Symmetry: C2
Subunit: 181 residues, 2 copies
């Protein structure tokens, strides 16, 4: 939480909706019950049960080398591909902490460059790490794309929204980016 | 139904098991209850509740231009990309009917060339077909690969197996190929 009203929330069947339109005319600082099917971290349909309009807050624009962009608050978490002691790990980073060069995870199903950054060296260096094969599988999922962050810029103060998704993961797709509730 | 005991059944976490090993030593012509999580048509975990060893039957080897191969009976259904009046449609074809040049659907998650054959012409020709966008989405899923069939050859008479998957679709992954129960 939270992102700007223009973010497109990925829905099933190649469909998508701006978050400000899920509860058209939602009051600022309102907790609204909804029953929406939304794509999760893997592009699979999951249930979102609350639309929160959290009022207006300072917001920052994260832009990708490819031109993708998402605007949300400083503490809004986006899933990034992080190098943790040699192992490429999928981890939530707050917008606050994203810097150019970071790799944000993109869910390709949200639409209707080359390789997992650092997987090769990881494989040849590790590989016979019992979970090296399980790791490779997840990173390697064909629905993922790793976009290089170009810039995180101040975007002003804006009305800001979030969803509540019924999932242990609590993630949804906003402009191709994997967002946390 | 049915395929040869060597077919690898795709399981979650990059794991896989030969179908003859799900119920080691299963009797020929036996209906066996199991509780196995298996990947479905999209690489998502689904429940398989029966392992059938259907005795020995004539079997045929379907080989792909890339070298992929699956061996099963004449009436065993494999999901293929078929041109139905200009629209690339995912349809079950029996091994009996597969010919070189056909495109079998491969689920990439079963492992740990270029483009949807005929989608472009379909898009430029159709596109503003209300479901043209929903269609493009499914065909376009990053987890799919379309392998060109090179040959369907007689493979002899062999003990043959099948799973029962708890799904309206009734599909499972066998050697990368999307098989029907």
């Amino acid at each position: 939480a939270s992102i700007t009203g223009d973010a497109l929330v990925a829905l099933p069947e190649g469909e998508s909706v701006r978050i400000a339109d899920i509860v058209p005319g939602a009051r600022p600082n309102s907790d609204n019950a909804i029953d929406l099917k939304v794509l999760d971290r893997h592009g699979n349909p999951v249930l979102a049960d609350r639309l929160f309009h959290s009022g207006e807050h300072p917001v920052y624009a994260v832009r990708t080398v490819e031109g993708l962009r998402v605007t949300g608050t400083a503490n809004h978490p986006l899933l990034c591909l992080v190098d943790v002691a040699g192992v490429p790990t999928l981890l939530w980073k707050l917008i606050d902490e994203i810097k150019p060069g970071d790799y944000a995870v993109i869910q390709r199903s949200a639409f209707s460059t080359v390789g997992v950054p650092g997987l090769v060296r990881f494989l040849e260096a590790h590989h016979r790490d019992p979970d090296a094969k399980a790791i490779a599988d997840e990173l390697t999922d064909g629905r993922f794309y790793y976009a290089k962050v170009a810039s995180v810029t101040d975007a002003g103060v804006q009305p800001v929204y979030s969803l509540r998704v019924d999932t242990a993961d609590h993630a949804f797709i906003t402009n191709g980016f994997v967002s946390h509730n």
